[PDB]
Write a protein that binds this ligand. Structure first.
Ligand code: NAG
Lengths: 49, 49
């Protein structure tokens, strides 16, 4: 897991490009994804970590 | 409260548990069910007991 650097990211066949930093917002155990108001994939949960 | 729905090949169970101050009926207040279990089964049901 690399953080603070723009890097291509692939999670379970989903690919996006960005800088990945820890998100203060917390979600319930069932959820595996987070989205923005524009229906964009704003946040993720690392599968391994 | 548990809500059961069968769609697109897999059975789904959603449960939220809350204590209620007043015995009569069900609370007017809004509580949202959180998925507890999702089961992938192809079973069909037209009756429940
Ligand atoms: C599923 O249930 C419905 C209603 O009983 C029935 O029409 C259908 O044939 C059942 N099985 C399958 C494989 O579709």
């Amino acid at each position: 897991l690399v953080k603070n650097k723009c890097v291509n990211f692939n999670f379970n066949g989903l690919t996006g490009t960005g800088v990945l930093t820890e998100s203060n917002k917390k979600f319930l155990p069932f959820q595996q994804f987070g989205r923005d108001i524009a229906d964009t994939t704003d946040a993720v949960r690392d599968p391994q970590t | 409260e548990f809500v059961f729905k069968n769609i697109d090949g897999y059975f789904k169970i959603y449960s939220k548990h809350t204590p209620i101050n007043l015995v009569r009926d069900l609370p007017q207040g809004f509580s949202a069910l959180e998925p507890l279990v999702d089961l992938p089964i192809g079973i069909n049901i037209t009756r429940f007991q």
